[PDB]
Design a protein around this ligand. Structure first.
Ligand code: HEM
Ligand code: HEM
Ligand code: MTE
Ligand code: MTE
Ligand code: MO
Ligand code: MO
Lengths: 463, 458
């Protein structure tokens, strides 16, 4: 008595005129008429249009209670049917890419690059897997579990070939909660100064998850490498994704970080308690805590030890910072170091730019984070464009010294006067007392990476 | 043949009327008349007035040549003679008169800014000095270093034992006071603290025992569960008996890479009295406050040092905090310092000649993070050029020493410049544009861009 629909067909209903449909479990709901009845307005609920409620239920667990579910059942109109998963490259190179939640803010479809709606970013310490930002340079690899092999070699160690099963049984499983931030986060603020090359990220190219897997340290020691090597040695990684020419995505990290127990570098097979999603590297990815997202290679195929940095294009000719004076005709990637640890950062996630907020009390919220395991010791929040500041409340548990891999969510509730204008700014300070710079121009660079000047959000107060 | 004078006497002769006297070796020279004949002008030579030429000779080795030593010998006027609670500072060591002194009792001073980046290693005589108390008079033979803590064998090391039981390690490290550049903070709103300019920072090659080796020798383990600390106590104390003290996390004390030393040598000689004789702690990449001088005790503890200066000083606060709301429990003790840089050449208000101008300075970052770039502006931060970084590369994570930089640029007659510098470290940390947003009641952690205005001779 209930018509069946595919995830794809449900994704066609994302608007009132079209009808707003959402899914939960294997049920399909038409909540067009409910949007106006939703507590807190339609702004958040409409973020789920055409897709699953799952991730949003994880952010706001009150929806899991019986009374909310009983309300939701009033809007049921169908059921989902298993999605067939078909014959690569006939249609196109990205034809086998996994489906994604429609609530993501996509800035590139082929290759797929997207960030979750900024208002949801600092609503939960662990970012739901369906909303975790995604950055793909190439088509997503389609991997058959049983035949996948991770190759590990290099000078001083034999040559291993580990199946997913062996990775899971041979090495003790460790979990590390770590925030991944792309080098291009907040690149859109760089473009306001002068046009740059790169994906036009807003403040959401950063997400946090509890990663589970083998320690890189343990796998390399098993391969026979020593705990320490004299001089500057590197651990190079190569993914299963490659361009038409055959060069795979690759990156490396210093050998010292790879072998250090406290550095928590993992060969992760689990993400937020479940198997790694395809977009995030199924079956295995490197996770390098405190280091720019580019080095956390997904769809891992090879691990090697070398006296030199990875020769990959992305290690050598991308992801570097330059003086603001450098232009395409003078840029020389030999003159700057590959980005490994990232500088202190923060952004306001609530309210959003252009909002008109009710007078009285306003709760300002956001995230703050610093690379290299350096914790956030304070976040300063201004309502007047950075003239005067108040200290925000830092949420969450502290971590051991030098191992603050996860962001600090913060919030501050402040009184706001009817009919005024606000310019809301946040800036964070880390455990080495490094701070964020006032403006973007002086840190501008042609690729628009390393965008950490204060985040400024303009809103008005209603009357 | 020659009258003999003490250093104190020679320090009274620093001008034409009193006569300008300087020393070299054990000789005293009256160079009053030679000041006008000194190549380059009187400015430089007069910096040494009343004191030793040694430190300056080290900055400019051209002075080591035969003709310079010979040119000086004709001005000899004499020879140097060696050597209660009403004045607790009566026992302090003599200092070079060329230092820029901000406090005499207790003694706190910095070298002239123009000399700071003139040599990678700062001569011992010019190395900035920060004393909270009177300097301890220590007899070498009877000096003992106490080491103790839970799970370790109590040690009582003499200087000789500190030199022989532990393999000597040498670490070149820059010490920077938390108040360096405080004067830029004062400009915005008055703060509490010594009025340092840009010279509360200096660099030396330190030599001593690794703290790690001493602790291991006592039986302490490489790692302790939870957050443990290593506390230091100096021999200097207030009138009530509380000694200067500080601490560093246990993890840093035991790390082989952290290079923390129990130093007994500074730039090749024994530690000067003002810099901790006979032994000081040197904590590379960490604020000067933690490098306890005149070390008397090393203790392992589950808690941070209870000292006043570890608990109720040397911390950073929001710019909104004032004396009526400051609460030292709300911030962490300063350990690693943030990226920093300053222009040492030209000096503020100078009138430089048209043509080419060489701008020079220093740059450094804490935590062993090397300086990867220094941007220099001549138009107040609108446009920037990249400076040349001098110095030798250090191993990743172990860049404890500053990077001296320079940039030569063409300057037009009759112009006005606003020279600005900013540095970037290897975790790509950067310095903030302005001082107001990082202001704090103690004026510490002053790392906004350094701005120097000068004019070009028309
Ligand atoms: C058709 C699906 C949905 C239904 C039936 C629903 C229903 C409800 C109900 C009954 C409450 C009040 C709970 C209580 O405290 O008793 C609530 C609150 C809330 N819901 Fe939903 N919701 C839906 C979808 C969503 C989605 C997708 C989001 C976020 C993307 C969301 C965000 C919120 C928030 C933020 C509140 C908090 C209260 C406030 O707005 O001030 N809801 N919702
Ligand atoms: C009585 C003590 C001194 C004597 C006899 C002396 C003598 C000289 C002589 C002979 C030269 C030229 C060497 C050559 O042939 O290249 C010279 C150069 C120089 N001296 Fe001294 N000097 C004295 C003190 C100082 C001091 C204390 C300073 C530093 C603060 C200083 C800074 C310099 C500099 C910077 C130059 C190079 C000039 C330039 O850049 O054009 N001198 N001095
Ligand atoms: N194999 C492979 N790994 C990769 C990439 C890639 O394109 N291929 N993108 C990198 C970059 S630049 C980032 S920011 C992170 C993003 O991870 P995520 O998609 O799971 O958020 O993956 C890194 N790992
Ligand atoms: N025992 C003792 N150690 C000390 C101090 C002190 O007053 N007593 N001053 C500290 C501070 S605040 C600094 S900045 C450095 C300065 O070292 P220096 O004088 O050798 O330059 O010493 C540190 N070590
Ligand atoms: Mo990235
Ligand atoms: Mo200091």
């Amino acid at each position: 008595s209930y018509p069946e629909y595919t995830r794809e067909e449900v994704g066609r209903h994302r608007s009132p005129e079209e009808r707003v449909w959402v899914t939960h479990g294997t049920d399909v709901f038409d909540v067009t008429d409910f949007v106006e009845l939703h507590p807190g307005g339609p702004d958040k609920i409409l973020l789920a249009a055409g897709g699953a409620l799952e991730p949003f239920w994880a952010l706001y667990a009150v929806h899991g209670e019986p009374h909310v579910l009983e309300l939701l059942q009033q809007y049921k109109v169908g059921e989902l049917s298993p999605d067939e998963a078909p014959a690569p490259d006939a249609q196109d190179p990205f034809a086998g890419d996994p489906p994604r939640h429609p609530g993501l803010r996509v800035n590139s479809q082929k290759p797929f690059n997207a960030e979750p709606p900024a208002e949801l970013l600092a609503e939960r310490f662990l970012t739901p897997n369906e909303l975790f930002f995604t950055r793909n340079h190439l088509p997503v690899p389609a991997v058959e579990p049983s035949s996948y092999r991770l190759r590990v070699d290099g000078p001083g160690g034999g040559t291993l070939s580990l199946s997913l099963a062996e990775l899971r049984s041979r090495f003790p499983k460790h979990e590390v909660t770590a925030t991944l931030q792309c080098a291009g986060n907040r690149r859109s603020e760089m473009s306001r100064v002068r046009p740059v090359k790169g994906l036009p990220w807003d403040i959401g190219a950063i997400s946090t998850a509890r990663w589970g897997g083998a320690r890189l340290r343990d796998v390399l020691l098993h391969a026979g490498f020593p705990e320490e090597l004299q001089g500057e040695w590197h651990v190079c990684f190569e993914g299963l994704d490659a361009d038409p020419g055959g060069a795979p995505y690759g990156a490396s990290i210093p050998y010292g970080r790879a072998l250090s127990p406290a550095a928590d570098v993992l060969l992760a097979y689990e993400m937020n308690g479940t198997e790694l999603p395809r977009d995030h590297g199924f079956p295995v990815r490197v996770v390098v805590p405190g280091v720019v997202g580019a080095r956390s290679v997904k769809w891992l195929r090879r691990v090697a030890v070398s006296p030199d940095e990875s020769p990959s294009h992305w290690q050598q000719n991308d992801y570097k910072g330059f003086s603001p004076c450098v232009d395409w005709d003078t840029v020389d990637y030999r003159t700057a170091p590959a980005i490994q640890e990232l500088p202190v950062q923060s952004a306001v996630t609530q309210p959003r730019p252009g909002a008109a907020v009710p007078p009285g009390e306003l709760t300002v919220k956001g995230y703050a984070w610093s690379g290299g395991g350096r914790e956030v010791v304070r976040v300063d929040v201004s309502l007047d464009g950075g003239r005067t500041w108040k200290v925000a409340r830092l949420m969450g548990d502290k971590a051991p010294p030098g191992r603050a891999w996860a962001w600090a969510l913060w919030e501050l509730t402040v009184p706001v006067e009817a009919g005024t204008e606000l310019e809301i700014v946040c800036k964070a300070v880390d455990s080495s007392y490094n701070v964020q710079p006032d403006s973007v121009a002086p840190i501008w660079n042609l690729r628009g990476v390393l965008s950490t000047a204060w985040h400024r959000v303009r809103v008005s107060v209603q009357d």
